[PDB]
Amino acid sequence: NTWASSNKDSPISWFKIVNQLFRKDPHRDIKEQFYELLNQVELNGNSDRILQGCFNIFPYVKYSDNGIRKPANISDWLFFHDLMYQSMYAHNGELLRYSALVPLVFFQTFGDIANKDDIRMKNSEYEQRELKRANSDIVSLIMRHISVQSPLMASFTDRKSLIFEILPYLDSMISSDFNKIRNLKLKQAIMEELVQLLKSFQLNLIQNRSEGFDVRGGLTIDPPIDEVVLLNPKHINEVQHKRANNLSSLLAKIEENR
Amino acid sequence: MLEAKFEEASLFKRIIDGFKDCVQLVNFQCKEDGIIAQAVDDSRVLLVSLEIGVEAFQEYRCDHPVTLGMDLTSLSKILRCGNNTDTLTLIADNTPDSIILLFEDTKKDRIAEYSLKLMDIDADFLKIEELQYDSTLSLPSSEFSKIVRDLSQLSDSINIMITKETIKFVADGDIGSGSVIIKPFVDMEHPETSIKLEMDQPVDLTFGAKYLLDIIKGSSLSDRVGIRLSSEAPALFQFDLKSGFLQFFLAPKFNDEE
Amino acid sequence: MLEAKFEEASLFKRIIDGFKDCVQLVNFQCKEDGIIAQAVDDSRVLLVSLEIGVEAFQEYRCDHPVTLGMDLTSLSKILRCGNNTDTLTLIADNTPDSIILLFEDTKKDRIAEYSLKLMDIDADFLKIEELQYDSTLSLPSSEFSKIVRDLSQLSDSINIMITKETIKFVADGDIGSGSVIIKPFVDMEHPETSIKLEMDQPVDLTFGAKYLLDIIKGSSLSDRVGIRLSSEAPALFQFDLKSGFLQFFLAPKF
Amino acid sequence: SKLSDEDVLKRLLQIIKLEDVKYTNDGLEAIIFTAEGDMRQAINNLQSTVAGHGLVNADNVFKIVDSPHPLIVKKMLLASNLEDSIQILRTDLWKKGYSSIDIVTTSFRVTKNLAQVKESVRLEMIKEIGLTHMRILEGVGTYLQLASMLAKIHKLNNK
Amino acid sequence: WVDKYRPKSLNALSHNEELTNFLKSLSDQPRDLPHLLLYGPNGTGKKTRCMALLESIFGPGVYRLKIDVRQFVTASNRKLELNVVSSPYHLEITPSDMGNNDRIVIQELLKEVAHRYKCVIINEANSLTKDAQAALRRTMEKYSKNIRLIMVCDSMSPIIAPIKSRCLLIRCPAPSDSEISTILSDVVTNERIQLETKDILKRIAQASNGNLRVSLLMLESMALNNELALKSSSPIIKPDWIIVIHKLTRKIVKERSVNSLIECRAVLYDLLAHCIPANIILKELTFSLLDVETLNTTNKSSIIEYSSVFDERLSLGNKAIFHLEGFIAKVMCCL
Amino acid sequence: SKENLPWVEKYRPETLDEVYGQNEVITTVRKFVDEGKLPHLLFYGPPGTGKTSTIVALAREIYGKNYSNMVLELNASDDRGIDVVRNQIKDFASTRQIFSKGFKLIILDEADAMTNAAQNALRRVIERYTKNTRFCVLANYAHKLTPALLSRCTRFRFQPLPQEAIERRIANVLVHEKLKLSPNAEKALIELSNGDMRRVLNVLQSCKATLDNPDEDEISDDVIYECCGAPRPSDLKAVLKSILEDDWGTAHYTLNKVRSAKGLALIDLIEGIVKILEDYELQNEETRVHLLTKLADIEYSISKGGNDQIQGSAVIGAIKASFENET
Amino acid sequence: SKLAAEQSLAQQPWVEKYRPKNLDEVTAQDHAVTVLKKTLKSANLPHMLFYGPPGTGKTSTILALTKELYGPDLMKSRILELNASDERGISIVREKVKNFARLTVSKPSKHDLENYPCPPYKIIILDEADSMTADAQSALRRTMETYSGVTRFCLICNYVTRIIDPLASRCSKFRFKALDASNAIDRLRFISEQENVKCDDGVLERILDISAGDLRRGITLLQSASKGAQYLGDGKNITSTQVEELAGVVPHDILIEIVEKVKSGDFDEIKKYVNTFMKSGWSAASVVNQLHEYYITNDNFDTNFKNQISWLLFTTDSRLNNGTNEHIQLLNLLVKISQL
Numbered sequence A: 001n002t003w004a005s006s007n008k009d010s011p012i013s014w015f016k017i018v019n020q021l022f023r024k025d026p027h028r029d030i031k032e033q034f035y036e037l038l039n040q041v042e043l044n045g046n047s048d049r050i051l052q053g054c055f056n057i058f059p060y061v062k063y064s065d066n067g068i069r070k071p072a073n074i075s076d077w078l079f080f081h082d083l084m085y086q087s088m089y090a091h092n093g094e095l096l097r098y099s100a101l102v103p104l105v106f107f108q109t110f111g112d113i114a115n116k117d118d119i120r121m122k123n124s125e126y127e128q129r130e131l132k133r134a135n136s137d138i139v140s141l142i143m144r145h146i147s148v149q150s151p152l153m154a155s156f157t158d159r160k161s162l163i164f165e166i167l168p169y170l171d172s173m174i175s176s177d178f179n180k181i182r183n184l185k186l187k188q189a190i191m192e193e194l195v196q197l198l199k200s201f202q203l204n205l206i207q208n209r210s211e212g213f214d215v216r217g218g219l220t221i222d223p224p225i226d227e228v229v230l231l232n233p234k235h236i237n238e239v240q241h242k243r244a245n246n247l248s249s250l251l252a253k254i255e256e257n258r
Numbered sequence B: 001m002l003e004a005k006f007e008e009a010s011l012f013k014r015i016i017d018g019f020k021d022c023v024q025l026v027n028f029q030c031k032e033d034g035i036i037a038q039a040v041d042d043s044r045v046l047l048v049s050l051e052i053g054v055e056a057f058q059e060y061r062c063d064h065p066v067t068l069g070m071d072l073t074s075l076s077k078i079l080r081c082g083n084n085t086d087t088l089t090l091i092a093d094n095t096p097d098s099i100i101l102l103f104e105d106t107k108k109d110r111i112a113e114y115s116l117k118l119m120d121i122d123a124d125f126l127k128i129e130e131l132q133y134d135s136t137l138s139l140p141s142s143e144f145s146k147i148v149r150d151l152s153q154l155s156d157s158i159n160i161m162i163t164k165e166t167i168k169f170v171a172d173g174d175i176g177s178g179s180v181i182i183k184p185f186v187d188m189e190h191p192e193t194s195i196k197l198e199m200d201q202p203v204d205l206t207f208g209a210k211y212l213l214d215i216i217k218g219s220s221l222s223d224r225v226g227i228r229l230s231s232e233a234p235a236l237f238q239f240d241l242k243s244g245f246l247q248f249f250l251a252p253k254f255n256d257e258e
Numbered sequence C: 001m002l003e004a005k006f007e008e009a010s011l012f013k014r015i016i017d018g019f020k021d022c023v024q025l026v027n028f029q030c031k032e033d034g035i036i037a038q039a040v041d042d043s044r045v046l047l048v049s050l051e052i053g054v055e056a057f058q059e060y061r062c063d064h065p066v067t068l069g070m071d072l073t074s075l076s077k078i079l080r081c082g083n084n085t086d087t088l089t090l091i092a093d094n095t096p097d098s099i100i101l102l103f104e105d106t107k108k109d110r111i112a113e114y115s116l117k118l119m120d121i122d123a124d125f126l127k128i129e130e131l132q133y134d135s136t137l138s139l140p141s142s143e144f145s146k147i148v149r150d151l152s153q154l155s156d157s158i159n160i161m162i163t164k165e166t167i168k169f170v171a172d173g174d175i176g177s178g179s180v181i182i183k184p185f186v187d188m189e190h191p192e193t194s195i196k197l198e199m200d201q202p203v204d205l206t207f208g209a210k211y212l213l214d215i216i217k218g219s220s221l222s223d224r225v226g227i228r229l230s231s232e233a234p235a236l237f238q239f240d241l242k243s244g245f246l247q248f249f250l251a252p253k254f
Numbered sequence D: 001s002k003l004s005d006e007d008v009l010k011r012l013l014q015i016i017k018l019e020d021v022k023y024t025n026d027g028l029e030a031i032i033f034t035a036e037g038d039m040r041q042a043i044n045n046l047q048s049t050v051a052g053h054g055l056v057n058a059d060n061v062f063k064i065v066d067s068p069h070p071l072i073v074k075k076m077l078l079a080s081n082l083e084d085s086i087q088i089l090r091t092d093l094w095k096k097g098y099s100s101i102d103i104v105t106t107s108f109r110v111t112k113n114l115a116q117v118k119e120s121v122r123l124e125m126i127k128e129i130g131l132t133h134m135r136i137l138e139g140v141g142t143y144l145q146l147a148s149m150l151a152k153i154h155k156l157n158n159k
Numbered sequence E: 001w002v003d004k005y006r007p008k009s010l011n012a013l014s015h016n017e018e019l020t021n022f023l024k025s026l027s028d029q030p031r032d033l034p035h036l037l038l039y040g041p042n043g044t045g046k047k048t049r050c051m052a053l054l055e056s057i058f059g060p061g062v063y064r065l066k067i068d069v070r071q072f073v074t075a076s077n078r079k080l081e082l083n084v085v086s087s088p089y090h091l092e093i094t095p096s097d098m099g100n101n102d103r104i105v106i107q108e109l110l111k112e113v114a115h116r117y118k119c120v121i122i123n124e125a126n127s128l129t130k131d132a133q134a135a136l137r138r139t140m141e142k143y144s145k146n147i148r149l150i151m152v153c154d155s156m157s158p159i160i161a162p163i164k165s166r167c168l169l170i171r172c173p174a175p176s177d178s179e180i181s182t183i184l185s186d187v188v189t190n191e192r193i194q195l196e197t198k199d200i201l202k203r204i205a206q207a208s209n210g211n212l213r214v215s216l217l218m219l220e221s222m223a224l225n226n227e228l229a230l231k232s233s234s235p236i237i238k239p240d241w242i243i244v245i246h247k248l249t250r251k252i253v254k255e256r257s258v259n260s261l262i263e264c265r266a267v268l269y270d271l272l273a274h275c276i277p278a279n280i281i282l283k284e285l286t287f288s289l290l291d292v293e294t295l296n297t298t299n300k301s302s303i304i305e306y307s308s309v310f311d312e313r314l315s316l317g318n319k320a321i322f323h324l325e326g327f328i329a330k331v332m333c334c335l
Numbered sequence F: 001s002k003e004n005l006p007w008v009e010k011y012r013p014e015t016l017d018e019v020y021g022q023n024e025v026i027t028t029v030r031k032f033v034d035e036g037k038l039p040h041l042l043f044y045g046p047p048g049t050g051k052t053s054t055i056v057a058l059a060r061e062i063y064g065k066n067y068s069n070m071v072l073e074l075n076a077s078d079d080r081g082i083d084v085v086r087n088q089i090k091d092f093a094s095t096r097q098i099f100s101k102g103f104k105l106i107i108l109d110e111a112d113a114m115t116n117a118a119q120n121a122l123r124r125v126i127e128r129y130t131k132n133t134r135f136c137v138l139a140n141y142a143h144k145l146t147p148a149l150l151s152r153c154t155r156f157r158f159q160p161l162p163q164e165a166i167e168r169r170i171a172n173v174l175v176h177e178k179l180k181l182s183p184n185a186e187k188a189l190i191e192l193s194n195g196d197m198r199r200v201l202n203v204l205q206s207c208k209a210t211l212d213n214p215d216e217d218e219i220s221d222d223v224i225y226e227c228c229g230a231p232r233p234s235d236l237k238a239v240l241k242s243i244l245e246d247d248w249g250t251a252h253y254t255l256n257k258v259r260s261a262k263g264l265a266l267i268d269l270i271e272g273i274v275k276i277l278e279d280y281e282l283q284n285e286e287t288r289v290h291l292l293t294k295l296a297d298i299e300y301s302i303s304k305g306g307n308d309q310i311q312g313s314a315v316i317g318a319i320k321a322s323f324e325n326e327t
Numbered sequence G: 001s002k003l004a005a006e007q008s009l010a011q012q013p014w015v016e017k018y019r020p021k022n023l024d025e026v027t028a029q030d031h032a033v034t035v036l037k038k039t040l041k042s043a044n045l046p047h048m049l050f051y052g053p054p055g056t057g058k059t060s061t062i063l064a065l066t067k068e069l070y071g072p073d074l075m076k077s078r079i080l081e082l083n084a085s086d087e088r089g090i091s092i093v094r095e096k097v098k099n100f101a102r103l104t105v106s107k108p109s110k111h112d113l114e115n116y117p118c119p120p121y122k123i124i125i126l127d128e129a130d131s132m133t134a135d136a137q138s139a140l141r142r143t144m145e146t147y148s149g150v151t152r153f154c155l156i157c158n159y160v161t162r163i164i165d166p167l168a169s170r171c172s173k174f175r176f177k178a179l180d181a182s183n184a185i186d187r188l189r190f191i192s193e194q195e196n197v198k199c200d201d202g203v204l205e206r207i208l209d210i211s212a213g214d215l216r217r218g219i220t221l222l223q224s225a226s227k228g229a230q231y232l233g234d235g236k237n238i239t240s241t242q243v244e245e246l247a248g249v250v251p252h253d254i255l256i257e258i259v260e261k262v263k264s265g266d267f268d269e270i271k272k273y274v275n276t277f278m279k280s281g282w283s284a285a286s287v288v289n290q291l292h293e294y295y296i297t298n299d300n301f302d303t304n305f306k307n308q309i310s311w312l313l314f315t316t317d318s319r320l321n322n323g324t325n326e327h328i329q330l331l332n333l334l335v336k337i338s339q340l
């Protein structure tokens, strides 16, 4: 148990301040608690991380609920914080003094005596930002591939239209169950059109042979469209099993054409 | 196969010094009558073109042309092991994934051997040289370097103007303007210092100083530099080698074009 | 008008090397008896003052004084075309907007000509030189440069102390302290290596090492350097030219 | 910690005794009031008043040093009627050359450090002040923006 | 496929005859041509019409284009990598491929580039930051004899007024359902599709809302499910994100609580992480929430007001989920 | 020659007797300098009040005509960092004068743009070297200065120029130039100044240029209003009356014809109507709240552009709905 | 030389072809050009700050002034033009602008002084000063205050609020007025006659009416109408309907349909009609402006309704001026005005 020297010289972990922002002590004046919390938020200088902590915690916190309006009032503050944070890169940081007020709105609105347990937290945003960057880089690479092959397609394809319209249909076409098609000629014609589409988008079939002793090196599409299109974890498993048989048939047809 | 042995590694090192910085990728091709190499910068305003005949080598054998592309930076990184006096042999098979540089001292003693990874570049050698240019002139290359180094300080553009018996280099920018005027003359006390000029038509072209600065490097390969100008094509600056030459073709600025 | 031709562009290039870095703006004035120039740094602790008499030139013509101010950096940028052996002619009309530098080789061959834009500077030449200084000393300038280069490493302040027959340079800082002690002496084997000292009063002044470092550049203009110190005024470090001199006046610390 | 009134008064009395200065009780009171626990600022204001007028009187101290800025801003924000606050802002702050940025920023500080009113109304007033601060930083800083900020603060205080 | 059957000239256009005639009029004299801004709904065919107009201003080689790369250095050592679509008569830049570094690429590339002129196609001009638009403001006027801009956008709302004034404005109205049906007819007769009844094509138009790019893609997607033979009751193929948004609205109108707000935030995160813009998400969510017959006019008015407010918030913010969750919570509080 | 400088630069005060408006601070500074006790000064005030002119004339009176050499004047145009402080300011404070004997003066003009680290390094330079040099900090916003640096200097607030001093300067300019000015024109000129001598001098030069004559005539209100593009009180009150009493369509037509006959701007009309309605003794403050809020919103929207007609109709409707609560 | 310039101007769009080259070509901004012409004979040009709506002629006015002052020879040597397409941070303002200001004026030639006044100062203009950060703007304060003897500063902007108060006080404020039909009909008729633009009686005045104080957009619309009338080759005159068709103006009947749907109709019918109307590409700003004109001009609505419609249109325009979705904003506006 070592903490005395910490109370002596160290501040309040931003996590401890977030858990304190959702706690009300019934034995102290609400105004004194508010000024103590304001001083702790100001001394920390990291108002953004405290607010992101408050944003991740508030849905799991117990708060006397009438119609979940409290959340509607806080979306307007959070929007005010985002405008203020954008303006900090444009203007000399005079606006930084108001950044400590937004976390204190959580204490006013959601602070309750019921919140005795510390809720642990994480950083979904850094993971979402890195994932959004990776997905944007994949999409930027597909858009470059279209620009090099499809001379006209590139003029009609916006980044948003590519993500929401073109890629989901392209993936649905590749993942379609060819085993239901009894007509061999029609199966061959569809496979020739799909090989032409894979060529127009420059989608390479790579045999991932990274399989420890298990006799099925899964075929993967490069770039992996699957990571951009497949939002639903249930659909990922169904699509992976169907694709494995289709991709082997498509690879054999690409090799035949080569 | 490629098998070219330079008497002195120094010659190859100076040649590569010429491609250095101004271009990133170089495409070499060895054949029965020698080695050629071409490199174009990203903006496509400068082409560096080399030709080394069979006689420039101490030993050259070619029964099957080989084309190979490589990163210039990687090559120069390796091109400081020649001791200048070392012997250098370039070696490659008919379908290479690498180029071998073999430096050896006279005695069996020390053998530095490198295996440089190659890049795949679509073979597309340009043949933009003209039959006749509006004007042709040669002068000591050290003199040309000084002329370029003077004017460069004043502007990002250096104009070359030619009229009967007159060659004039001019730069004009923020701090002021400058000019260097030279006149044709035959020095019998040593003709390597003469300044020749053959004008079929007066010319007046502007070039980006950054590019002329890249070009002056050729001084290290030849005492004189030949400059051929035309209003119909890129200008040619040429540095002769014993059996060969290093050429720089530079597109005039349109008004803003390097 | 201004019309001054230097035999060797090199002399002018070394002179400007002296103003270089330590000052930004220089005010030149040509007249019947030659050319003078003054430049003061931003903090006003250093004044660089030049005088080139008519005889230092191969050709000089002046029927009407001209004062012209310019950016030192712009001038040096242009001052590397002299080939050192090239001939240099400074040219300007009576009401100039520019200064023309004309470098020519002996033969008609190559002519590099520059037209430098001038700056307007309120003419206000200082005349801070003293009649008598507490102490005066001269010694080889390469020796003075070494002395300055030694001590500079130790501190941002180098103290010069003078007592009868003794000159002592001292620096004291973080890593320790250093000192260089020199004594007056006449070397007949070649008097350009002698160290003279005339002391009317012992002196003890401190200077910012960064400034002494700027000053040592004058070594390239003269074999010897004259140092005149006083407790009443800026110190004078002087580098003689054939018909002329380059002077650096430096204000002591507190 | 801050220096109480007694300590600064004692130090100023010692300095006056050591300097033989003509003073009065109201002048020293105004000096200590404008000092706000700042001994250095107190001695500086005392010396400036002495060298500017000779007699340390409240009139001289007030004419050579304006009243504590935050106090007029607090009196403006704590006004009960809109016209009183508007007249205070016009005469005391705007007609004397106080920039709008200083007024709004001093305003934010006063509110943050306010204790007369509750927490929620203080947060709403800070929100309105900060919206005015936003508008002002964009170059729209005028008297109309501060008047609208005061009107919104009063509307919040208007139940 | 959309790309296999696309017009390459002005005489090959098959809808908006008045727009084709206006383009022919504007291309009659090509040298005295001002800058152009094509605005209208997304999927109308403005990017095809701009290339068709270039095909009238220049030779047929305008479609033979190539993709190159250009590197840029910002104020720091972060290297900006941008690919360029270039042609021997024009070039295309899309500043929507990066963050706040649009101004650098715009100014430097356009200054380097600046019949007799070379056309420039700025794709998705709505993503151009205000600083990049301000930088382009004077570049549009200083170099008017060598560089002509053809900016393709879907809404002139984020475009500043100076840029709007500095170029002609050309509106591209979405084609009528009849023209879409006629185009789908030619496509299915060329692709050899089997239609039991023609009216299904009309329904495709009624499911596309004027979008031809979406119409042809959906027709081809449902032609693969029916095995190249469309019947009288072939199901309509809807994108996955539209189904997710519809399920989200069902969850909204079914349950209004914080526990459901958590899973709503999770769905919003899963939608945003898969390259789906938040403005389109908000638009579709609001439009499909207004379609809920359980609500009344009082609820729909508040919903549209909150959607406009939070659309302004999202256009003024950068953390899109911070506004999306707020709008969802306000809608939950309204219902 | 001084005849080429603009009127703002040509008429810059060179002595402390030419600085009008500021009397309580000018006399105190003169006494500080005559008696010898000149503390560290902090001239805080709005632009165009005469802080730079005051400190320049003060340094001239202190050091003479050689002011440009015995004073270290730094401003926002020059690089003012922490290293710049450490080297230049400390070397200036620690050393002495090269031209005469006496204390030094460091004029940190526009020091509200300095870095926090620079002020933190300078606050100990001011306290250490205080027997041989002084510090003068000029500021427009007192919030950009650290409280430590703000407490070491004696603060002087430059009030806006009053009517008497600005009229005295106008009379001085009318004496120096072959120009005549109407009394009502002079009053209108003082009204559109807000205590800014720069604006007065600029518009005076501009209306002298507008005269088109060899200056044998006078400058009336029409010249000033047409040159500065400012609305007249007559048209202002006419628009306000037509908005308050007349019909909606008639009010729209009146506003349109007024703003299109003289090319007036909607923002100037907004500010004028705000200034006029400030004297209106009104009922329950709800009308004032609504009026101020809506007018500030419309002004902030105009500050970013939009449709001028829509914004004018918005102003009309806002004023009307605000006054509808007064019944 | 000059003939190449004439041909390049003749092969240039009408916006750049008819750019004012002299101070007399300015048609409506007379108050500013009068002072600019008077100071042309004197030598006391002050620091200027041009501000106003876009397309009023600020850049053209300053270019014509600099030309008439310096001649086509000194036009390229005594001018420092900095636009928004260049870097204008603190570093640039401190190094480049200050070095150019501290430099001396270039010597005029013998031909310059014989035809042009050749003032003893140079001009540094900063176009689109709205993008300049406030610190880089405050850095210009003493730069323009101390070197005023050798250089003069001309700021150009659209929103005068984006420039800090000290800079706005140091420069003389010149407000450029909107170019409506009254003060620009002469220039529009001159442009039409110089290009043989055969139009009807009320076309030009209508064009500026669509321009809303913008001569550049009016000239562009006139050029488009002339091209569309020359392609047809019918030899008839341009009509106001043909002009408002290509100007993005919604037809009167389509607007009357919107008025009927707003007056009579529920949320569902209004939403369906808005979804149908958004299929045909129309700018929401123009629709809002036309609705505002119709509602405020029509003498058939109550004043209480008029205050609310004006405030709602103001809010809708303020929201649309931020890059929002046109469909959502238009639907919200129509729904809010339907509840009235």
Ligand SMILES: Nc1ncnc2c1ncn2[C@@H]1O[C@H](COP(=O)(O)OP(=O)(O)OP(O)(O)=S)[C@@H](O)[C@H]1O
Pocket: F007, F008, F009, F011, F012, F013, F018, F019, F020, F021, F022, F046, F047, F048, F049, F050, F051, F052, F053, F054, F139, F140, F161, F169, F197, F198, F201, G166, G169
């Ligand atoms: N009190 C005054 N008396 C006479 N002229 C004045 C006065 N104040 C300002 N002026 C005039 O306005 C010009 C500018 O004055 P400055 O001192 O530079 O303004 P300022 O008070 O320093 O405000 P800044 O520089 O924007 S922070 C002077 O050159 C005078 O022509």
Ligand SMILES: Nc1ncnc2c1ncn2[C@@H]1O[C@H](COP(=O)(O)OP(=O)(O)OP(O)(O)=S)[C@@H](O)[C@H]1O
Pocket: E141, E162, G014, G015, G016, G018, G019, G020, G025, G026, G027, G028, G029, G053, G054, G055, G056, G057, G058, G059, G060, G061, G157, G158, G187, G215, G216, G219
């Ligand atoms: N007063 C005018 N007289 C004649 N032509 C004008 C006038 N104002 C604008 N124009 C025309 O419009 C063109 C554009 O002029 P500009 O000066 O660039 O407009 P602007 O005020 O700069 O708008 P910006 O740059 O968006 S703020 C000119 O080349 C002229 O053809």
Ligand SMILES: Nc1ncnc2c1ncn2[C@@H]1O[C@H](COP(=O)(O)OP(=O)(O)O)[C@@H](O)[C@H]1O
Pocket: A155, A156, A157, E002, E003, E005, E006, E007, E012, E013, E014, E015, E042, E043, E044, E045, E046, E047, E048, E049, E183, E211, E212, E213, E214, E216
């Ligand atoms: N004139 C035309 N006739 C028939 N189909 C067309 C025509 N113009 C475009 N299309 C097709 O209609 C769809 C329009 O979507 P898209 O091309 O993305 O629009 P945009 O050109 O605006 O980007 C595409 O399938 C396109 O090929």
Ligand SMILES: [Mg+2]
Pocket: F051, F052, F109, F110, F138
């Ligand atoms: Mg000042």
Ligand SMILES: [Mg+2]
Pocket: G058, G059, G127, G128, G156
């Ligand atoms: Mg402009």
